[PDB]
Subunit: 401 residues, 3 copies
């Protein structure tokens, strides 16, 4: 059922291709091989499982160190006393999760100043272009997207963006949509999402993004080819992380509020058709259950899984994770299998949604203002490609689990 899932996902991409005959079998064959093998290595092979576990524990340690800054600012409100007083409601999201975005943004900026990020990206991106035949720039952007967000990753190849082929630009877009970022990864981890899955999905996003970019927009043209000190670097990162944290916080207040209002209205509207219990989650579960089943979620869990996967696609993954997180605790409304939890975790791990197009337009567009028309034109296809990559990663994860 998983292998059928993989075939259908690949087939959809081929059906949507700008030119199926231009599809490079080495590129897309190798890309799928890498995404599949990467998953096999770290989710199934003992030595790989241990490397993943080791990496994840380090990430967990870094998060905990960063929480010392949070503890200073908010004191008792992020202490154990909160759970005694308020019970479950003692976990204040605004103080527990959002500040991690600030710390990690500062850390990443420091690692860029020190040249550490560039070193890792150069190695991974180099391996990708040699194996796949993808261009230098698009391969580096794909690798950068493992660690940073869709508008930050292309910065490592910013002078090459204005003259990128349409296929290159599309791949750059897909690499961002198929992945997340270090900051929010730590946020999702703080919400209870398994770090191993997040790290695995992040790394798998690089070949996965190239896979579906090159299936849906094969190359038909010919491609071509700093802060004053480390403290300034950290400060710049903290500032950017602050803006992100404020925006995420405002988005969540509004979007979760709007879903509640939508459910209030759907209840009244549904009542006209004998369904006063109608809610957005029900519509999404009903609509997306076949997709969840297709990627390997058991029949009796596909509807609940569909709620989260659907919400990620029609809104964004942060809102989706916010609703999925309770199902990872002991107080879960529905106790899901460990394979279903994993599949959902992987399928949600991406910036692939329609609103990300506007973000790419501004961020990626500022890097090449004459290409904004191209970005807008390819936006929906890029979101589909990114969605397919997330789904494929989830299917693969479901397979080896």
């Amino acid at each position: 059922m998983s292998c059928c899932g993989m075939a259908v996902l690949l087939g959809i991409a081929v059906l949507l291709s700008s030119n199926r005959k231009a599809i490079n079998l080495r590129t897309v064959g190798g890309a799928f091989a890498i995404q599949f093998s990467l998953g096999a290595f770290i989710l199934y092979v003992p030595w790989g499982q241990e490397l993943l576990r080791g990496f994840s524990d380090a990430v967990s340690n870094v998060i905990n160190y960063g929480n010392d800054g949070t503890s200073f600012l908010f004191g008792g409100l992020v202490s154990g006393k909160m759970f005694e007083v308020f019970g479950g409601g003692g976990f204040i999201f605004a103080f527990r999760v959002l500040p991690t975005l600030i710390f990690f943004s500062a850390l990443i900026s420091v690692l860029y100043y020190l040249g550490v990020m560039q070193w890792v990206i150069r190695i991974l991106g180099g391996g990708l272009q040699k194996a796949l035949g993808t261009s230098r720039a698009e391969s580096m952007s794909a690798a950068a997207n493992i660690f940073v967000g869709q508008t930050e990753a292309p910065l490592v190849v910013r002078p090459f963006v204005p003259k990128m082929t349409q296929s290159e630009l599309f791949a750059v877009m897909c690499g961002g949509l198929a992945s997340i970022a270090g900051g929010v990864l730590a946020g999702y981890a703080s919400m209870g999402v398994k770090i191993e899955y997040l790290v695995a999905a992040s790394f798998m996003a690089a070949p996965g993004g190239l896979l579906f970019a090159k299936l849906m927009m094969p190359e038909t043209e010919k491609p071509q080819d700093k802060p004053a000190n480390v403290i300034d670097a950290a400060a710049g990162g903290a500032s950017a992380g602050l803006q992100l944290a404020l925006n995420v916080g405002a988005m969540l207040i509004a979007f979760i509020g709007l879903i509640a209002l939508i459910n209030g209205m759907l209840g009244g509207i549904g009542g006209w058709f004998g369904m006063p219990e109608l809610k957005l989650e029900m519509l999404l579960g009903w609509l997306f259950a076949p997709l969840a089943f297709l990627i390997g979620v058991p029949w009796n869990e596909a509807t609940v899984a569909g709620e989260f996967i659907g919400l990620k696609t029609v809104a964004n993954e942060f809102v989706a994770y916010s609703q999925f997180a309770p199902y990872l605790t002991e107080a879960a409304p529905v106790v899901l299998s460990e394979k279903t939890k994993a599949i959902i975790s992987f399928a949600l791990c991406g910036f692939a949604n329609l609103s990300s197009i506007a973000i790419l337009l501004g961020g990626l567009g500022s890097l090449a203002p004459k290409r904004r028309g191209d970005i807008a034109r390819m936006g929906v296809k890029a979101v589909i490609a990114g969605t397919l990559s997330n789904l494929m990663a989830a299917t693969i994860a479901g397979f080896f689990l």
Copy 2:
């Protein structure tokens, strides 16, 4: 005493008119007739009272739905447990009131994307121009101001602003000053201000604003005549609401702190004249009590009412409402009559203050940069006109109550 109040308010406007002889009796006669009749309909007439009550309950429901987003972000800190632990101080303004500005800003942006706002505005604005003979653009801006703020309302007629007559521009300014906005309305509602009064004052602001704009600046010239998707729209609204919420929060911290400092100084200064108990509230109550009496506040409550009305005028209505709100609870320093509470609520319901001029200069001015000189020149008169509109609405409300 109320009818004398109305006459005096109208008379002040005539005295201040740019040209009393140019005053159109159909326009200003009809405008007052509408504001008066609207008040009669929804505050006195049974069917109207029920429509107002019905509308207000829906608004109350929407607020409650939006608070689900707040609950997610701040958890226990906006739960019932807070009142057990901290008593009255368990109500954290920053978390209870300010986030509502974010949710409603997102909602309004969604309703604009969907064309719902434009539909309502087109009907109300159309009714106004046909009845009053006011221009198309200024009538639409007046109607828009019922729902959105002074810098947002003119956006519905933004290409007509640069070539507006001085009278039109003045009316656009007055419509914003005479009203509030959906976001802060929900904020004031969350503070305990009766939703019915806020909704009534908002609707009454549209004819009221035109009434005093056309009394004080009659037409002497001849007038003339988008986000990519709904999710982007919501996000844009949340972002704008976030900025508003942060600014309101900072303003309140500073202004309430400055009033405390001012009172500290006034105590020392007053002591020199045998009045060590001197405070800003006393000065304002003393100065504005005749105005409160004039609009229908009983003699023995006019001084307390004057404090709030005065504070609204010399600072802004948010600060005023922040100080008035305790008088709406059981722990009120002075138990005021229901008519006085209503009168104060109406009189405070407007952006009419001197600081709003600077806001109009930036917001409305960006729509027509060559008209910034005009905006500055007419600023004080526009604030007076807006104040008169609020006072008239309060007098009318006091009449039918």
Copy 3:
């Protein structure tokens, strides 16, 4: 030992001078005389101690008035109940300290609108230029820096900045680096730092900054020679203070988190050399202990003092004060002498750090865009000069204490 400290500090500046032969003995002799005498007057002379105490009590009163705005916004979370529930962790830094930056920024803006700041600055700056022979503009900027921050102080002489001599510009830079600002002073006071020391250090920064600016960059060229209302002024100040408060909060979360991560890594790295207990504080204490000893800290307290002084220099003074503050309470890890507490307090009281260069580049540079190259070139020397001024003030304070 203190007089040797003063001599060494002066000597370092002479060694680093752009031209020792161009050093004006009247200027630098008088500047040191003023900084020394000011310290004698307010820290030793009874009448001066009483003026300082009186000024500090007023500042303390103003802070308390401003906290009424904080109380309104955050209610129970800044009440005495917090200490009952959470103990020491009941003091929430984000709500107790950061909002004071907002109130004071609004207050300062009001005092500028009213002409009060300009009056005081004119008198102090006038006294400085007449006594020292320093130029009008650089003397006014030095005096302004007593009250406002490094990018705000030059605004009082902004049309003279583009054509300043290199020596003048350097002095303007040094005056900002040698001092702090009214907003954060109130923040540091709220953290437990003695107001008397903060006020004393602020005033001593004006001659101290000129002293080391004129020692290290003597004049070799020839020098030359608004909000609509008070409510707008307050609002503008609140807005600027809000941005500062958000940035300081984000910086603290990130920097304190990064120090924790650094200590995690140093523990592992140190372990390789038989020092698993290695931390950043130990490195800094070891590196800066001789400097602390030099300025008058007793041998057995110099290492602990070095931690704070070192942290201020390599990061910034806010982070330094955040770590020093616990040592001012009863729960201090090490009970330090009152003289050591004072010396540390003075030595930390300055914006002198490398990151402040980037801030001067933006803020001061916008005032004279053609001088940004000069600012960058003189940045490190200016930070050294500012550091020397702070150290000299601490040595002087240690002397009379």
